[PDB]
Write a protein that binds this ligand. Structure first.
Ligand SMILES: Cc1cc2nc3c(=O)[nH]c(=O)nc-3n(C[C@H](O)[C@H](O)[C@H](O)COP(=O)(O)OP(=O)(O)OC[C@H]3O[C@@H](n4cnc5c(N)ncnc54)[C@H](O)[C@@H]3O)c2cc1C
Ligand SMILES: Cc1cc2nc3c(=O)[nH]c(=O)nc-3n(C[C@H](O)[C@H](O)[C@H](O)COP(=O)(O)OP(=O)(O)OC[C@H]3O[C@@H](n4cnc5c(N)ncnc54)[C@H](O)[C@@H]3O)c2cc1C
Ligand SMILES: [Cl-]
Ligand SMILES: [Cl-]
Lengths: 505, 505
């Protein structure tokens, strides 16, 4: 079986240039790669927060160290997601916030600290879960850096960056290593009798041929959905948000500092993201069209940040769900042309490089053994489903009942059996779980606990086992005190996030 | 909710004393534990090989180091399973053997050495997979120790031991730390209107009461099956063997040495185990009653080892399957009273301490929250199913067609969708996967490859990706050469298994 020789990527967004970079890297020899992107169809223009796997899975694989790509794309640090006004009836006189922190929660004699915390709360302990079980939240309040002045990491973290800059940075990297860039527009996809893609017809009359096609054409899915007619499974019965009004907002970094985390500010009919970096923060009101109008949501967004009726905006709508099959015949969909959940928790770009990782692990020859694509397609479903569960958990758990949108999340969502089971185990007092392993069950006990406890849904009781383990309870107190010590050191030890980034220019 | 106070274990076999030890360990305080065992109903008398998790999960948890319990139970080392006459038509003039080795196979640029080996075999490379991808098989042929004279580990391994001695060793350990032993026989189990166990009536007239009951009564399942009437799911449609004829056989260790591995010698209608230790080896012909008679199988067993018609034997039959629920109301089944697959691959005792681990992780209070047992019961099904897949893979993969029994394994077995999927991925050329994580997918790429390749079922082709990675192919050759070096060092470096064990008395 002859190997793949010519690859064509359709799309010049983040997805296409990640695909181009990764593939040019994975395929040392016998690989000609061409990417074509329409000068007249813009990128989506968002996608600026991430999760920890980005470096280990994507950039490391490219051989691009964190200190090299960060300053090139206005990179900033994301130590958490701060959730604001999610907990219940928004009250401007009450501080309703909680963090979803990255990183592992320690175990004490095989039991997560979360569960010793719950036991204490039962005895009247007032401190919130994440402030007792992690050392860094207080520092986040102080908008400090996730690492020392000298660059030594001090807490688990991901990244923020400029979406357009990232795409451009990879475009340069990829082109430099042999990727052929073509600024042009596909207008016809031709299929042989078998149903495979033979070539693309462009607006300037070019005919592009290839063995393998990567569809990174974004939500229109030029190859996978339209040409190959693979159905998209709409899942707006699982999740309500289908729109966003977004913009970049200037920040007075000198007076207000740079927050080392993404913020999720709950709204009337959705929520608003805040992704800070030097000079400004990306922002966007994610909402459901069925509970508010774009006009109405736009006014809410402008009001939230005190913006003016002249502020140019990025109006977006998106589909929620996944292709029935991500890879069909000789076409692999990657990016918005494949699956999407709303930007809560930031899984979009992870879907890109996780899919690319799976693609290489299932790489075909020109005979396109269906066993390979089927195995690939099944991994995508798992990856997507795991995240859909976690995202959904932010919603049907809410105690907010003040608008139709929150009522609908409370009562009207379709839930997978998988999330039902986890919730049932959680409520019973049981701990949840504590790359290939990461792609696998990426969201652990700690993550679900940050969310559930932040939202004010606690288990029915502490673990029955703990009543037999007074020693263990004692050791846990020691671990709590230790955490409290580290928290204090960091306060006087970490530079401000603002100052640290500036020291990176 | 009041905690559990009184626990009664029924059964004095390996299962009961593992339960008693583990529980007395896990439950520091507020735990009274009584074990009752009928002097007139003997233990099963087998169960003498194990897998690597035994130490980390069971003995370590007890605080009993390997050097302390081994000499107490005639412990020996198990570095592998050697399979003899499994490959095809048995021919006394052909050496048909292969090893299933414990331990991980190295990865080269994210691809297991197994797959680089396959690529070489395609070019005419003659050496067998396990001799190229692991350093220790040749040493096993030489019956060497898995560690240096001084006791430094040199290869991954599990253990062999005397079944009765192990049970007795734990009995002493457990009794010494507060377990109450009662030599007596349960004759009636009394249930309240709710259907929970109130107490046990013994033959001497004792009435035993408790909050929690552990059923370790072996295959009769005195509590779970008979009293509580939980159905046992027969799975002799998944696996054919239902009987064994066993005995201990003296060995001339001075002239023949001690093999550092379990042997699996395929027979006409089953297979025969060889579990060596100092002085003798446990052995047993596992067979299907539907393809040979006990009388016939007995004669085959005696002939295999040159035994005499006077040799006293352990005649066994066993059920294959699992309880519909391992834990029902206030009764947890552990051991042969719960699930069993035939002894191929040695999962029996693993089922014991893995279940005990899950029991403590789901430990109840006296209200017996059904969410706990349901979560427990589901983990048991996963554990069992994963092993049933792996065991089944030894059979429907066989190329032997010389008896009805092998024909039946070839064509007539009921296969899970899970094993079908793995096989399909394997055949396509894809790698398979590479405690809580162990219980999870304990059988990895290497294990399945040892088995499949030993049995002579290879993938349809090498990984398409490798054609683009000449560099990677090169590095793999280096790794192969390195493995060959270590193999040579061990040959001149390891003491004989026989000599090493003797140095332990
Ligand atoms: C509101 C919103 C918020 C998000 N927030 C996050 C986040 O916080 N974190 C995160 O990781 N992800 C996020 N995502 C997802 C993320 O934005 C995308 O995964 C990422 O930006 C890559 O998108 P893309 O390249 O597939 O699509 P696009 O940006 O839409 O790129 C499409 C490309 O295909 C080209 N193209 C299309 N059609 C044709 C044609 N017929 N001929 C030629 N060329 C063509 C276009 O010109 C363009 O270059 C968010 C998405 C949305 C919608
Ligand atoms: C042929 C064969 C080979 C095996 N090989 C292996 C192997 O290689 N590796 C491995 O790990 N496992 C193996 N196993 C499994 C292993 O033998 C068992 O898991 C282990 O020995 C524990 O068994 P048990 O204690 O549950 O049952 P048993 O040994 O049958 O113990 C039963 C106990 O319950 C008591 N009892 C019963 N009934 C009553 C009553 N009404 N009143 C009072 N008391 C009572 C009995 O007196 C006895 O003490 C094998 C099993 C078989 C059958
Ligand atoms: Cl996202
Ligand atoms: Cl077994």
């Amino acid at each position: 079986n002859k190997p793949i020789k010519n690859i064509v990527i359709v799309g010049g967004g983040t997805a296409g240039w990640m695909a181009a970079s990764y593939l040019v890297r994975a395929l040392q020899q016998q690989a000609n790669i061409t990417l074509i992107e329409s000068a007249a169809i813009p990128r989506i223009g968002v996608g600026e927060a991430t999760i920890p796997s980005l470096q280990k899975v994507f950039f490391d694989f490219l051989g691009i160290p964190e200190r090299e790509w960060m300053p090139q794309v206005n990179g900033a640090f994301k130590a958490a997601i701060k959730f604001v006004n999610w907990r219940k009836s928004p009250d401007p006189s009450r501080d309703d916030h909680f963090y979803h922190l990255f990183g592992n929660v320690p175990n004490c004699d095989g039991v997560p600290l979360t569960h010793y915390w719950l036991r204490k709360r039962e005895q009247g302990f007032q401190q919130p879960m994440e402030y007792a079980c992690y050392p860094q939240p207080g520092a986040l309040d102080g908008k400090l850096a996730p690492c020392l002045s000298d660059g030594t990491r001090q807490m688990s973290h991901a990244w923020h960056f400029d979406a357009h800059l990232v795409a451009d940075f990879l475009k340069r990297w990829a082109v430099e290593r042999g990727v052929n860039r073509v600024v042009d527009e596909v207008v016809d996809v031709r299929l042989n009798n078998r149903g495979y893609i033979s070539n693309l017809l462009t607006k300037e009359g070019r005919t592009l041929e290839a063995d393998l096609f990567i569809d990174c054409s974004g939500m229109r899915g030029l190859l996978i959905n339209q040409a190959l007619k693979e159905p998209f499974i709409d899942m707006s019965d699982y999740l309500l948000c289908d729109s966003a009004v977004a913009s970049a907002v200037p920040n007075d970094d000198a007076r207000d500092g740079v927050e080392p985390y993404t913020s999720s500010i709950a709204m009337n009919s959705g929520w608003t993201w805040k992704i800070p970096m030097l000079g400004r923060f990306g922002s966007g009101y994610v909402f459901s069209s069925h509970f508010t109008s774009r006009d109405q949501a736009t006014a809410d967004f402008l009001k939230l940040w005190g913006l003016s009726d002249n502020q140019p905006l990025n109006q977006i709508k998106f589909r929620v769900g996944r292709n029935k099959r991500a890879w069909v015949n000789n076409c692999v969909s990657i990016g918005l042309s494949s699956c999407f959940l709303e930007p809560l928790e930031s899984t979009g770009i992870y879907f890109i490089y996780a899919a690319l990782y799976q693609l290489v692990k299932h790489f075909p020859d020109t005979s396109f053994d269906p066993r390979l694509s089927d195995a690939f397609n099944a991994e995508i479903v798992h990856m997507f489903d795991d995240c859909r569960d976690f995202v959904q958990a932010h919603y049907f758990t809410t105690s907010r009942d003040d608008t139709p949108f929150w009522l609908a999340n409370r009562h009207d969502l379709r839930l997978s059996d998988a999330i039902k089971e986890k919730v049932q185990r959680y409520k019973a007092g049981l701990p949840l779980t504590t790359f290939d392993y990461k792609f696998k069950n990426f969201w652990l006990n700690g993550n679900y606990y940050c969310i559930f406890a932040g939202l004010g849904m606690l288990p029915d009781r502490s673990l029955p086992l703990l009543q037999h383990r007074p020693e263990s309870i004692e050791k846990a107190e020691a671990m709590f005190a230790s955490i409290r010590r580290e928290a204090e050191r960091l306060r006087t030890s970490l530079p401000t996030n603002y100052d640290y980034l500036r020291s990176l220019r």
